[PDB]
From a paper:
Here, we use cryo-EM to image both the PRV empty capsid resulted from abortive DNA packing (A-capsid) and mature capsids fully packed with DNA (C-capsid). From the same dataset, we selected a total of 14,252 and 8899 particles for PRV C-capsid and A-capsid, respectively, and, by imposing icosahedral symmetry, obtained three-dimensional (3D) reconstructions at resolutions of 4.43 and 4.53 Å, respectively. Local reconstructions were then carried out to finally obtain the cryo-EM structures of the C-capsid 5-, 3-, and 2-fold sub-regions at 3.31, 3.46, and 3.43 Å, respectively, and the A-capsid 5-, 3-, and 2-fold sub-regions at 3.64, 3.50, and 3.41 Å, respectively. Five CATCs form a star-shaped tegumental layer that is situated on both the penton and portal vertices, forming extensive interactions with the penton and portal proteins to stabilize the conformation of the vertex complexes. Like other herpesviruses, each CATC of PRV bridges the space between the penton/portal and hexon by binding at two triplexes, Ta and Tc. Based on our localized reconstruction of the C-capsid 5-fold sub-particle, an atomic model of PRV CATC was built; however, only the N-terminus of the pUL25 subunits (upper pUL25 aa 1-73; lower pUL25 aa10-83) could be built out as α-helices; the remaining C-terminal globular domain, in contrast, was disordered and failed to be modeled. A comparison of the penton and portal vertexes also revealed a slight difference (~6°) in the orientations of the bound CATCs; such discrepancies may influence their interactions with the triplexes underneath. Indeed, we observed that the peri-portal Triplex Ta rotates counterclockwise by ~120° when compared to peri-penton Ta. The portal-containing capsid reconstruction revealed an ordered, layered dsDNA around a less-ordered core.
The PRV capsid, similar to other herpesviruses, has a triangulation (T) number of 16 and is composed of major capsid proteins (MCPs), small capsid proteins (SCPs), and triplexes. The MCP (VP5) is encoded by UL19 and forms pentamer (penton) and hexamer (hexon) in the capsid. The hexon MCP is decorated with the SCP (VP26 protein, encoded by UL35), whereas the penton MCP lacks decoration. The triplexes, each composed of one VP19C protein (Tri1, encoded by UL38) and two VP23 proteins (Tri2, encoded by UL18), anchor to the capsid floor via Tri1 N-anchor.
Author numbering:
A (entry chain p), J (entry chain m): 3 to 50
B (entry chain g): 1036 to 1054, 1056 to 1323
C (entry chain g): 691 to 739
D (entry chain w): 494 to 542
E (entry chain h): 24 to 82, 94 to 340, 348 to 368
F (entry chain o): 1 to 296
G (entry chain g): 51 to 326, 337 to 444
H (entry chain s): 1 to 148, 168 to 296
């Protein structure tokens, strides 16, 4: 779910928790949560 | 058939632990999936070995069941206990922690079955027991009849258009025989009830959307009974594969029986003599 | 029930089931003695004089 | 309590695995019963021996 | 290795710069629920708000070093009082010790015993202190010297117990035994006489896995004088009625008055004998409570060496549950 | 010894709810490295006594991370060196640092996951500090008892404190508190009365001694050495011939009482299963929030 | 001493009942699926009622997860000898070490074997649960297309109720006839339907056309069949000796890592969208009807001398019912012959009273009768 | 820690019999690292009550290896709760997976590996599940209370058991307990409208024999029936007592059975893995 | 334990417990004539020994 | 969402509506449904 | 377990009194004799070679 290859760097840092209004989803975990390292996919094997 | 199953085997892995010694416990995950539209396998049940359970008699004892309000004069039901539990196995002996039937000693044949008794007027026609019948009289089941047929009485009995039922004390909603062998009336005991599946509509939640569903479901329905020295109730989780066409028809077969031993003799002859009667054997076990 | 077995077994052994015709008080005098089930007989409104 | 000998025991329910007669019925020519540990004949009132 | 606990708190009772590491610390319950449970727990006759007042007279602070608590009891050797008083940096300290004494003496009077107010943690090893705010750190399992203190003079530590309170048992009871691995128990001793009562603390070691009869005999005088002066201030009625004698002759009476089951109402239940078990002012269990103990761990050796002290030997922290000692 | 549980795929939305219970405990059956969710399931409307008795014949295990495929558990009974683990407190009131937790069924109003897609329910037992649990059980039982005799139905003092805040002890009719607890209060009150009766039958003159000088003296003599005031237990009357319908052998009754009391005392928990050793966190964990624990 | 009978799963004829492919990343996949599409033909009616359009429909079947496992415990006394910690400098400890390592080898040899008979058992466990009985299967296939109105469903259930109770035990109640058995077997073989074709099976006869199915039995029934009704076809068959493979690589990887799915034939879909060793094993065949199937009874090659029951001894279940104390109406009591079971002269006839017991034969044959007083367990209880 | 038990010289007639005792438990008295066999030894069978009282005063130890010189052991519980070891069962009832086990002195005697050369005998205690050990202790203590496959008591220690029992029972009587004692008829009447309510009450209940024979009046209001409530206190006290009544007469369950692969139920005379508590 | 007790029913006809109260209990009449450790052995063979 | 390339063809035909109970989810339609024609995707258009 | 040995001995009791004599009770069923001989041969097990 997270990104693999960033495209553009950000020139200016800012406090993010102030500007929650500009964003549509917002998730801020402390440090190294457990969800990032789940590689669990699902797909069709064969069609007929 | 040539290719009836896809079979995927994963990758093995070796988990260690300590137990005196060292327990290496292998494990390999694998999965399969049917890949043929329609059926791809069948079996016939050709031969027959000895019946794994005895086909004898064992009068079921209710005194292992609770939820029935007792009788006021405690001496009365004390006498009931003191006389009916006498000379009756599977009596709830109050040995520590369980109050369960004591472990019997020695077995004639396979595990002994259990018998029930359902009230019925004396003027029930006898010919209803020659062919395969339903202990209720309303032969509802599910396969032949839409929902609402199991307890209605403004609609005829499908298997006997003549009457409405054949046993008033055993068919009506909230009738007597219902209040003892139903699914949601909390009057079950540790002993198995061979008629538990005949007075139960709780499968109303499991509505049937195809005859093939019931067909495939039969022949592999997990076992409801135990495997000890009796027919005890078993947790539904464990189970075991067993075949039973009863739950598809909700019908029972009459065994070879007669109201006098003097009728069941090698020169069989007449099948109705006097008040004493005989019932020929019409079952899947003609031999 | 302070009654021998026979009265519980049959229905006509009870000392509490009055006969349909009585000429005296002998059955009634025997009736009230069984309070294990509160019995009562109403004669025109009075118990009996 | 009722004496077992007088009130008849049973026809089939005697051979049941529970009753207190099989324990004392094991010879066609002799009987076995329990009795007060006294000499016979003894005094009038039954002693609690 | 061993497992640790860190609890930031106030520097009122355990003062981790004043003592060096290696001494057991206790966790103090929130006092609000103690003051509340008193309202329903103090026995009849006694006061029912005096613990409220005793607490209000001492005004979160959560830990208390055993070195501090042992001083605020009856049993103590005045050398340790002098040490706690003149060696603690803190202001107003002796006054606080006095108030704490009054608190515990109120606790036993109100039948909410301090053993239901002090869970035990391990021995502290480290601390960082602001101005009157500390964060102590104590072991919780494993052996003490698996830790690592930031002293740099003695990385590891031991366990120190005030030798004034350490009561040995086996050599006391003369079991004739031979010192091997012995358990370690922290025990409390209550005594109940209204407005004249106190609390005694001890630290007991022995091979006895089950104290029980051992303390019941050790504290015989306490149990004796506690069972008789404990019911005081409770109005007992006059001489007990003869109807209080529970009739036993009537169980296997073949001929006796009997009642049909389910009819305890107005219908003829009068001929039954009356029996009034009436128990008002007799010694209840909380009245005969005299001691309470809790297992601490296992010990090799105890040596005495200096203020007198008692260095443990290979203490393995294994804390257990509390226990009553009333019978 | 970490077990995984096959998970029959349910749906979106519900799987989020299953993900939210990443800290509770579940009672397995046997230590096998595989198990089906259908196995660890209990009808969330159930008898409290039977559930508390069954909690012994099982193994506790906490739900670690979950995935749409499976969920991982870790048993608490067996273990190596008692490693740390996380636990979601789910009692009615918080628990402090440095104490012992106990596992009791949802005695008060119940909460239960209803996985409507798979058509099964789950019960997650409460997590209580030791003394507070041993007192809450008595609270609910005593309220039911006071109600039983039809006396004053309320006294305004069925409240329990924990770290300041006052708790209300929700009204005893919410889910089935008038039905799923009847068994417990009956089975406890009855045994208490029976013990009292047996004692008084063995010592008939106990409650006719001095109100303050006889009873205390008897108790202190009994606790001390072998005087015992002779056979303080007077010889009970001789029984009937064991077929008379009114036979009463007191000693067999005492035997049955000892057995039943021991059994009931063992099927009540009150033997700690874990101990909070939180570290690097707020020293007091509120309900619903995880808390570092080491198994005992 | 004793050897250890090794067995490979691909040699057995049961392999031709399934396709086996290693999928080394199964431990990662969530619930996988497979998509079918099928297009039912249609015939042109005529007349008043309007015609219909040819129908289409899709479907998917999800997987299910199973697993194998086996314990392999070794002890401390020998663990100290393997790793050399407990090893001593002697001429005697060396021999004990040799013994210990030989024991470990002879143990791992057995535990590795179990993962072949594991599949041998799992395939039977699986197939045994999806195959409906033949009895309930023939007439349903005879009534296809008419199960819309109720009356046809009734005509179908009235025939199921007979097929269950009459065609359920052959070769035990028919031991005089021969072609009835073979014809029942033909119905069994022809009532199913062929599944998807794949080029990886190639399960061929020694000479010619490929095989179609298997026939697993218990040794007794196989013995009764191979000497009266069925003639052995041949004694060998060329089979595949390798598995298949489904791996994730270089196109499935990007999609599985960023999107969350990965189709098996992803390379084919890609290269189309944008432009872009048979072994010989001694198996025993048999010809039935017009087909050619493997005939086995695995009770010996596998499952032998162990602690598991054979999954081919199933369990039938019947519920009997008998009336206890019914009394026939007046107009139905009659002696078939005037010379009746005449009782002893001088005493009255108890054959007129209402009967109060039933007599039935037990499992072996000794009669055991049920009387009213046995119902005391039911008709004497407050529940009444 | 590994207790080391040294052995004297032994005849081959009994060394080979001692080899077979690889999963049974013995009772030391002090936990030194070394200890001679003569020390850990109990006299021949007698006074199962006294012996059961002695197991409380000593901590157990199970043995693992038996060499021609040396015989190891393991102190069962002093600091550990997960030292998974193996010990063989020697009680009649087969113990199943899941439940705890408690040590109980042997009955009838006859279990004595009588060593003639060393001139001593051992009596290894049997291992029973909790549910049945409780009942056995109940039976034996009741029989001891009677005297004011079965051995008779000794009248010198049976009084101690009686004392413990009568104390634990006496301290149940509280001014709150009488309030509960007041609703015996209100309990019996409740045990009539329903089935479970009647089920919980036993048959020789020793209370139904009372509620139908004696009437008791309304209880006297205790001192300050407004501030505090007594039923709660009495019930809490009873819970606290009953939670620890079983062990005070018998012995705490010492270990619970866990098995990872083998068949669930293990028969008598066969070793089975375990974890201690 | 199945041979001499009379609480566990007859394991061949489980209706009753025994089919002959004079030949099944220990020390019965028919037992004291053909038991191996009561020693009334004569010269002739005994098929029911 | 139909398949684009079937792995293998089905050998035998059968009335499939009657055997519908074997399958988990499915759907039939008259002929040439409009839904399976428009297929629109959702794309993230730059990570940062 | 008991349930297995029960049916085992119950089938043994039937196998004794039906198949203790062949080629004297059944000379008509010529093939049944060869059946029984094949059973007899295959029922045993090979020893070490």
């Amino acid at each position: 779910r997270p990104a693999i290859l960033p495209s553009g760097q950000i020139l200016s840092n800012i406090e993010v928790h102030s500007h929650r209004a500009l964003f549509d989803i917002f998730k801020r975990f402390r440090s190294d949560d457990n969800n990032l390292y789940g590689a669990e996919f699902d797909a069709l094997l064969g069609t007929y | 058939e040539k290719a009836s199953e896809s079979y995927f085997m994963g990758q093995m892995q070796v988990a260690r632990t300590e137990s005196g010694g060292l327990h290496l416990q292998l494990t390999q995950p694998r999965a399969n999936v049917d890949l043929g539209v329609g059926f791809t396998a069948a079996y016939a049940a050709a031969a027959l070995r000895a019946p794994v359970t005895d086909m004898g008699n064992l009068p079921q004892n209710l005194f292992a069941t609770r939820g029935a309000p007792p009788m006021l004069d405690a001496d009365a039901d004390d006498y009931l206990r003191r006389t009916v539990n006498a000379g009756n196995r599977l009596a709830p002996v109050p040995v520590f922690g369980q109050m369960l039937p004591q472990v019997p000693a020695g077995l004639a044949r396979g595990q002994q079955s259990v018998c029930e008794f359902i009230a019925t007027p004396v003027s029930v026609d006898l010919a209803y027991f020659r062919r395969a019948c339903n202990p209720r009289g309303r032969a509802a089941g599910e396969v032949h009849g839409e929902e609402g047929l199991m307890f209605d009485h403004s609609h005829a009995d499908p298997a006997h258009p003549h009457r409405a039922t054949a046993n008033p004390w055993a068919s009506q909603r909230h009738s007597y025989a219902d209040r003892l062998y139903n699914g949601q009336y909390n009057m079950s005991g540790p002993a198995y009830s061979p008629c538990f599946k005949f007075f139960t509509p709780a499968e109303a939640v499991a509505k049937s959307r195809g005859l093939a569903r019931l067909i495939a479901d039969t022949g592999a329905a997990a076992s409801p009974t135990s495997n000890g020295e009796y027919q005890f109730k078993r947790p539904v989780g464990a189970g075991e594969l067993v075949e039973d066409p009863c739950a598809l028809f909700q019908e029972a077969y009459p065994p070879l029986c007669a109201s006098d031993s003097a009728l069941l003799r090698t020169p069989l002859g007449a099948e109705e003599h006097f008040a004493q009667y005989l019932i020929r054997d019409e079952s899947p076990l003609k031999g | 029930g302070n009654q021998p077995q026979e009265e519980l077994n049959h229905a006509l052994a009870d000392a509490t089931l009055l006969p349909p015709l009585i000429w005296d008080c002998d059955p009634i005098l025997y009736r009230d003695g069984l309070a294990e089930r509160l019995p009562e007989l109403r004669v025109n409104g009075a118990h009996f004089q | 309590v009722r004496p077992r000998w007088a009130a008849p025991a049973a026809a089939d329910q005697l051979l049941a695995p529970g009753n207190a007669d099989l324990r004392l019925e094991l010879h066609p020519a002799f009987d076995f019963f329990v009795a007060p540990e006294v000499d016979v004949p003894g005094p009038f009132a039954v002693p609690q021996v | 290795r061993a497992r640790l606990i860190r609890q930031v708190t106030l520097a009122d009772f355990c003062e981790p710069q004043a003592e060096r590491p290696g001494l057991v610390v206790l966790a103090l319950r929130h006092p609000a629920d103690l003051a509340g449970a008193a309202y329903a727990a103090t026995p009849p006759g006694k006061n029912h708000r005096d613990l409220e007042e005793a607490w209000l007279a001492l005004d979160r602070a959560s830990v208390v070093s055993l070195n501090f608590l042992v001083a605020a009891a009856e049993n103590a050797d005045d050398a340790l009082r002098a040490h706690v008083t003149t060696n603690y940096r803190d202001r107003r300290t002796a006054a606080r010790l006095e108030r704490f004494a009054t608190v515990l003496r109120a606790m036993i009077r109100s039948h909410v015993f301090p053993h239901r107010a002090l869970h035990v943690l391990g021995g502290l090893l480290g601390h960082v202190t602001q101005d009157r705010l500390a964060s102590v750190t104590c072991v919780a399992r494993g052996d003490q010297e698996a830790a690592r203190t930031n002293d740099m003079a003695a990385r590891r530590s031991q366990v120190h117990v005030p030798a004034c309170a350490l009561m040995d048992v086996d050599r006391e009871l003369r079991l004739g035994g031979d010192d091997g691995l012995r358990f370690a128990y922290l025990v409390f001793v209550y005594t109940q006489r209204h407005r004249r009562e106190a609390l005694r603390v001890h630290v007991a070691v022995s091979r006895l896995p089950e104290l029980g009869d051992a303390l019941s005999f050790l504290l015989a005088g306490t149990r004796v004088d506690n069972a008789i002066h404990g019911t005081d201030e409770a109005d007992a009625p006059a001489a007990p009625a003869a109807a209080a004698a529970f009739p036993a002759y009537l169980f296997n009476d073949p001929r006796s008055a009997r009642c049909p089951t389910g009819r305890l109402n107005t219908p003829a239940a009068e001929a039954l004998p009356v029996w009034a078990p009436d128990m008002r002012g007799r010694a209840t269990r909380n009245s005969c409570m005299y001691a309470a103990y809790v297992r601490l761990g296992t010990v090799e050796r105890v040596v005495r060496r200096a203020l007198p002290l008692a260095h443990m030997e290979r203490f393995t922290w294994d804390v257990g549950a509390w226990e009553e000692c009333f019978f | 010894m970490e077990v995984d549980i096959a998970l029959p795929t349910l749906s979106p939305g519900d799987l989020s709810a299953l993900q939210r219970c990443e800290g509770r405990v579940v009672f397995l059956e046997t230590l096998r490295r595989h198990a089906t969710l259908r196995e660890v399931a209990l009808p969330c409307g159930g008898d409290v006594l039977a559930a508390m008795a069954a909690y012994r014949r099982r193994f506790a295990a906490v739900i670690t991370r979950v995935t749409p495929h499976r969920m991982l558990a870790t048993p608490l009974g067996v273990g190596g060196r008692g490693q740390s683990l996380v636990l979601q407190n789910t009692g009615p009131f918080d628990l402090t640092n440095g104490d012992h937790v106990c596992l009791v069924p949802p005695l008060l109003g119940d909460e239960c996951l209803r996985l409507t897609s798979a058509n099964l329910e789950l019960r997650f037992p409460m997590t209580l500090p030791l003394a507070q649990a041993r007192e809450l059980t008595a609270r609910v039982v005593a309220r039911a008892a006071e109600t039983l005799r039809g006396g004053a139905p309320a006294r305004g003092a069925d409240v329990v404190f924990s770290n300041g805040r006052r708790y209300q002890l929700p009204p005893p009719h919410r889910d089935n508190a008038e039905a799923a607890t009847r068994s417990l209060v009956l089975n406890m009150i009855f045994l208490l009365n029976e013990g009292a009766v047996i004692l008084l039958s063995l010592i008939p003159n106990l409650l006719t001694l001095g109100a303050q000088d006889g009873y205390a003296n008897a108790v202190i003599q009994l606790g001390s050495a072998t005087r015992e005031l002779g056979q303080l237990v007077r010889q009970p009357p001789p029984p009937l011939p064991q077929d008379h319908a009114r036979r009463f052998c007191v000693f067999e009754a005492l035997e049955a009482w000892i057995a039943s009391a021991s059994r009931l005392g063992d099927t009540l928990g009150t033997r700690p299963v874990a101990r909070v050793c939180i570290f690097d966190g707020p020293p007091t964990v509120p309900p619903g929030e995880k808390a570092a624990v080491v198994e005992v | 001493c004793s050897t250890l009978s090794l067995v490979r799963f691909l040699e057995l004829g049961l392999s031709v009942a399934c396709v086996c492919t290693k999928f080394p990343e199964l431990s990662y996949v969530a619930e996988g699926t497979i998509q079918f599409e099928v297009q039912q033909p249609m015939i042109a009616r005529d007349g008043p009622h309007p015609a219909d359009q040819p129908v289409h429909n899709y479907m998917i079947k999800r997987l299910d997860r199973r697993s194998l496992n086996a314990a392999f415990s070794i002890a401390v006394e020998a663990l100290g000898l393997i790793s050399g910690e407990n090893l001593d400098g002697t001429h005697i400890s060396s021999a004990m070490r040799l013994r210990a390592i030989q024991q470990l080898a002879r143990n791992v040899q057995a535990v590795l074997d179990s993962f072949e008979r594991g599949t041998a058992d799992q395939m039977l466990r699986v197939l045994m649960e999806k195959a409906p009985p033949l009895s309930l299967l023939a007439p349903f296939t005879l009534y296809e297309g008419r199960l819309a109105d109720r009356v046809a469903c009734a005509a179908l259930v009235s025939e199921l109720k007979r097929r269950v109770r009459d065609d359920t035990f052959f070769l035990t109640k028919h031991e005089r006839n021969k072609d009835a058995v073979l014809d029942r077997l033909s119905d069994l073989v022809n009532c199913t339907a062929p599944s998807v074709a794949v080029a990886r099976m190639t399960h061929a006869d020694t000479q010619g056309r490929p095989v179609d199915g298997v026939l697993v039995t218990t040794a007794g029934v196989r013995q009764r069949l191979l000497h009266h009704v069925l003639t052995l076809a041949d004694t060998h068959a060329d089979v595949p000796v390798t598995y298949g493979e489904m791996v994730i690589a270089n196109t499935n990887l990007v999609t599985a890592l960023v999107m969350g799915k990965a189709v098996s034939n992803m390379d084919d879909v890609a290269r189309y969208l944008l432009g872009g060793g048979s072994a010989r094993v001694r198996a025993d065949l048999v010809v039935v009807g017009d087909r050619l199937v493997f005939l086995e009874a695995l009770e010996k090659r596998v499952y032998q001398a162990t602690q598991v029951p054979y999954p081919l001894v199933g369990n039938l279940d019947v519920t009997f019912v008998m009336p206890l104390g019914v009394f026939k109406p007046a107009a139905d009591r009659y002696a078939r012959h005037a010379g009746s079971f005449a009782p002893t002269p001088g005493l009255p006839d108890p054959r007129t009273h209402p009967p109060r017991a039933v007599h039935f034969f037990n499992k072996d044959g000794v009669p055991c009768h049920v009387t009213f007083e046995h119902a005391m367990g039911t008709l004497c209880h407050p529940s009444f």
